Amino acid sequence: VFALGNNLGSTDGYLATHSQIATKTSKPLLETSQTVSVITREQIDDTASKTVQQAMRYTPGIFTGQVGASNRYDYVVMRGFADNSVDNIYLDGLKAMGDSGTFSSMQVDPYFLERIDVLKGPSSVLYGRSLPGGLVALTSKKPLYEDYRQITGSIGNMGQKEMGFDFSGPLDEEKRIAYRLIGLGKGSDTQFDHVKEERYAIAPTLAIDFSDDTTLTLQGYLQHDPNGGYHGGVPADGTLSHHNGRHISREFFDGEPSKDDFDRTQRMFGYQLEHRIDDVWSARQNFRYLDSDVDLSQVYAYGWSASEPNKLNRYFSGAREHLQAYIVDNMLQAEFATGAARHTLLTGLDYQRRRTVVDWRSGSASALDAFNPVYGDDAISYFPDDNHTRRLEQTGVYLQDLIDIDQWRFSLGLRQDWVSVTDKNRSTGSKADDDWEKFTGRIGALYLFDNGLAPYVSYSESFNPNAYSDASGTPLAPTEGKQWELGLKFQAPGSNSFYTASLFHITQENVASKEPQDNFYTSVGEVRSQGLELEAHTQLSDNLKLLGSYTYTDITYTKSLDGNQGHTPNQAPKHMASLWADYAFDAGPLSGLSIGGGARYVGETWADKENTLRVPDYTLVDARIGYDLGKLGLKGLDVSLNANNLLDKDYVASCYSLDFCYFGEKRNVTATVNYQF
Ligand SMILES: CCCCCCCCOCCOCCOCCOCCO
Ligand SMILES: CCCCCCCCO[C@@H]1O[C@H](CO)[C@@H](O)[C@H](O)[C@H]1O
Ligand SMILES: CCCCCCCCO[C@@H]1O[C@H](CO)[C@@H](O)[C@H](O)[C@H]1O
Ligand SMILES: [N+]
Ligand SMILES: [N+]
Ligand code: NA
């Protein structure tokens, strides 16, 4: 049992029944007055999703192409909110604790995950600092109480290789103590020349039941990325149009080898303490400590040469970053009735503390020819170094009541945050400080008809520290999100099908804004995003599965001083849609055989804020083939073949600006062997 901080429920194929992402306590999706999606392990495997970001490509209201084919960082753009998207990720109920002002953003490998939950819209009432589009919660694999061993091996195009193991089971005869150990070695060249991706990782977990009332789970996670793939972009000039010839830049071009490093080491440890005091009272403590090192050397293009026509100007970023982060969450929950109302009453206290020590380097590099490049001119003319020590502290006190009365399901939430942010410039000695407090609230109401139909309304709020400063150096007031949401959910009792529609209106306040010829940013900007998301999980035939999604997003700068008032942010398609299907045969000569595939539509988008050039829309096809060799007398050994972007479309996924456009991933072919015993 133990609802507190756990999803529970069941999962079948691609469909989960319950989640805790919106409640911090197990609640059926059908009875939750928020838009929640769950991506199961199976879905992650079936679509051959290599990253958390790619796992999200069949979920509505999420755009997955912020830096195109890059896999260095997880960019999950929700309801159109691309800024600070890298900070959307929670792991096991706790913020990842990276610093989106630095290069020190963490990445969790999907191999270690049981599920991915997605919460749309402002959600600070239970989490604190966060973005107005929503948040993502990763649930790691946990120790199983029966023996489970799996070895996995994979090989594909682009020099893709991966090997992993996954071992779990009990350690005593009474099954009160259990362990899990997951390992991973993997690598890939990219579609990009002179680029490499490489990762090694291990995660030990240990669960100990003390009594019927207490479980303690201890977790470690150690990950080393000696190479971080590609994190570059090139001008719209030679990608969305020709440049100086029919010359268009290849989907394979680079910056400078011999000065191309990205080394990221992540060391996490934590525990989850679950104690039931009563059938009424339960308590939980989630704790995670993170220590990471990032080392970066990157020469990159910035515009065309004014001198040499088919050459790009290049610049250099270098970084040595050490991040230390503590997060704890303390929860107390009472479940009780007051006459005809059932209350699930949660009070909590959470604490985040982060310290980032950064040494930044910058300079100018040699110009490079975009078509037919000559490498080896790696001399840099360095600019003044920039060294900082960044600190962030957040203390939150929150209270929630989930009230069930008759068919009504109500949600009431209140939270108070104290945030302290420091920036010491170690090059100049100057120190910026800022302390403030924010209240946030949420009210939700849902009606559960006994046919499985649930309409609902929700009001929700968020805040996030402002990335920009008055430029007098103090940070600006934190941004604020406010959402009204109307939704409809449907599950047919008994059916493994689930349908939802979500209508949303989000306002983001205090966004930084300035006149183009102004020095000082000011916090008077405003962004509004409204739209509709439709999502369907359909089961038929006992062996045909289906996923469908449609998204409409109207996001606008409703208030700006920069001359882009009324405009639509770049990287925000008005329309997206997807569909996936998987057919298995369980009887006949084709037994143990699986076939699946799907398609993904991303509407046209703006290349630039100033809305002067469009990035073409695109439709991509994914396919898979699998076979359980168990049917041939090889028990627990099965084989998969995957292909994403099957038609191998060469396209620009998105652009950060007219100077930085990103190529989508080329065809990815993958073949995997899994062995249980
Ligand atoms: C009933 C009061 C509160 C509940 C509000 C939820 C209503 C959500 O509306 C969904 C209506 O859209 C259904 C679309 O079905 C066909 C697809 O067409 C959509 C293309 O624009
Ligand atoms: C679907 C119902 C929409 C109601 C129309 C909005 C009326 C004013 O909206 C108000 O906004 C305030 C701050 O954003 C909140 O504190 C209030 O709860 C809300 O009533
Ligand atoms: C998507 C269905 C919900 C209807 C949206 C209600 C209208 C927007 O909501 C209201 O808008 C006002 C002006 O933007 C704000 O001042 C209020 O805080 C906000 O509650
Ligand atoms: N930076
Ligand atoms: N620069
Ligand atoms: Na756009």
Say yes or no: CB of residue 442 within 6 Å of ligand 2.
no
Nearest-Å Rg of the Cα atoms of the chain is 25
User: b or e along 368-389 (b: 16 or more beta carbons within 10 Å of the residue's beta carbon)?
Assistant: bebeebebeebebeeeeeeebe
Q: Is the CB of 486 under 6 A from ligand 3?
A: yes
Q: What single letter denotes the amino acid at residue 507? A: T
564 and 624 co-located in one domain: yes
Q: Please identify, among 118, 143, 168, the residue that sits at the C-terminal boundary of a domain.
A: 143
**Helix, strand and coil in the chain, % to nearest 5:** 5, 60, 35
Range list of β-strands (E), 603-636: 605-606, 614-615, 618-628
Resolution (A): 2.2
Segment (H or E) for 280: none
Cβ of residue 482 lying under 6 Å from some atom of ligand 3:
yes
Look at residues 111, 143, 175 and tell me which one is the last residue of a structural domain: 143
Nearest Cα residue to 158 out of 283, 248, 252, 74: 252
Q: Quick one: which ligand is closest to 386's CA?
A: 4
> How far apart, in whole angstroms, are the C-alpha atoms of residue 396 and residue 318?
35
Cα 592 from Cα 416, distance rounded (Å) = 54
Name the nearest CA neighbour of 152 among 141, 142, 160, 162. 162
Cα separation, 515 vs 536, whole angstroms? 44
Q: How many CB atoms within 10 Å of residue 502?
A: 25
Does any ligand 1 atom lie closer than 6 A to the CB of residue 488? yes
Which protein residue's CA is at the shortest distance from atom 15 of ligand 3?
507
How far is Cα 632 from Cα 214, in angstroms, rounded to an integer? 44
Q: Do 286 and 408 belong together in one domain? A: yes
Phi-psi domain of 71 (left: phi exceeds 0; alpha: psi -120 through 50; beta: other): alpha
How many A from CA of 188 to the centre of ligand 6?
31
Q: Report how far residue 301's alpha carbon sits from residue 371's, in angstroms, rounded to the nearest whole number.
A: 13
Burial of 364 from C-beta contacts in 10 A (0-12 / 13-18 / 19+): middle
Q: Looking at the DSSP assignment, which residues form a beta bridge with residue 572?
A: none
> Long-range contact list for 4-8, CB < 8 A, 24+ apart?
4/274, 4/282, 4/283, 4/284, 4/331, 4/333, 4/346, 5/93, 5/272, 5/274, 5/284, 5/286, 5/331, 6/274, 7/115, 7/117, 7/139
One domain for residues 98 and 182: no
> Which atom of ligand 2 is nearest to 457's Cα?
1
Residue pair 147/169 in contact by the 8 Å Cβ criterion: yes
Residue 302, token pair as written in the block = 């910035």
What is the distance in A from the centroid of ligand 1 to the CA of 66? 28
The SS3 of residue 52 is: helix
The length of the chain in residues reads 677
Provide the residue range defining the domain that includes 104: 1-143
Are both 30 and 179 inside the same structural domain?
no
What DSSP character marks residue 127? H
Q: How far apart are CA 356 and CA 164, in angstroms?
A: 32
Q: How far apart are CA 497 and CA 14, in angstroms?
A: 10
Q: Do 428 and 484 fall into the same domain? A: yes
Which of 143, 175, 196 lies at the terminal end of a domain, its last residue?
Answer: 143
Full DSSP string of 210-277:
-SSSEEEEEEEEEEEEEEE-----B-STTTTS--SSS----TT--S-TTSEEEEEEEEEEEEEEEEE-
Per-residue CA distances from 602 to 58, 277, 615 (Å): 11, 50, 10
Phi and psi dihedrals of 192, rounded to 5? -95, 140
Q: Which two tokens stand for residue 243?
A: 């440049």
CA of 86 relative to ligand 2 center, distance in Å: 29
* Determination approach: X-ray
What letter would DSSP give residue 664?
Answer: P
96 and 177 belong to one structural domain:
no
Number of domains in the chain: 2
Dist CA 477 CA 468 (whole Å): 9
* Residue that has been written with the tokens 């051959």 in this structure: 48
* 52 backbone dihedrals φ, ψ, rounded to 5°: -60, -40
Residues 105, 229 within the same domain: no
210, two tokens: 């003390």
Closest CA to 266 of 89, 407, 388: 89
Whether the CB of 459 sits within 6 Å of ligand 2: yes
Is the minimum distance from the CB of 503 to ligand 1 under 6 angstroms? yes
Residue whose C-alpha is closest to residue 123's, from 397, 482, 434: 482
Per-residue CA distances from 209 to 218, 265, 422 (Å)? 12, 32, 41
Query: In terms of domains, do 124 and 167 share one?
Result: no
Domain match, 258 and 113 both: no
Per-residue tokens: 581: 């299907």
Q: Same domain for 101 and 170?
A: no
Closest listed ligand to the CA of 507 = 3
Give the integer Cα–Cα distance in Å for 79 and 371.
Answer: 37
Discontinuities in the chain (C→N > 2.5 Å), after residue: none
- 255 Cα–ligand 4 center, Å: 18
DSSP symbol at 5? T
Query: CA 392 to CA 325: how far, in whole Å?
Result: 9
For ligand 5, the distance from its centroid to the CA atom of residue 382, given in whole angstroms, is: 11
Is 194 found in the same domain as 137?
no
- CA distances (Å), origin 285, targets 26, 276, 430: 16, 12, 38
Distance 101 CA to ligand 4 centre (A): 7
Together in a domain, 65 and 181: no
DSSP for 343-381, written as a single string: EEEEEEEEEEEEEEEEEEEEEEEEEEESSS--------E
Per DSSP, 383 falls in state: P
Which residue carries 């194929």 as its tokens? 13
- C-alpha 244/C-alpha 446 separation (Å) is 59
Residue 89 β-bridge partners: 136
Pairing state of beta strands 148-156 and 177-189? Answer: unpaired
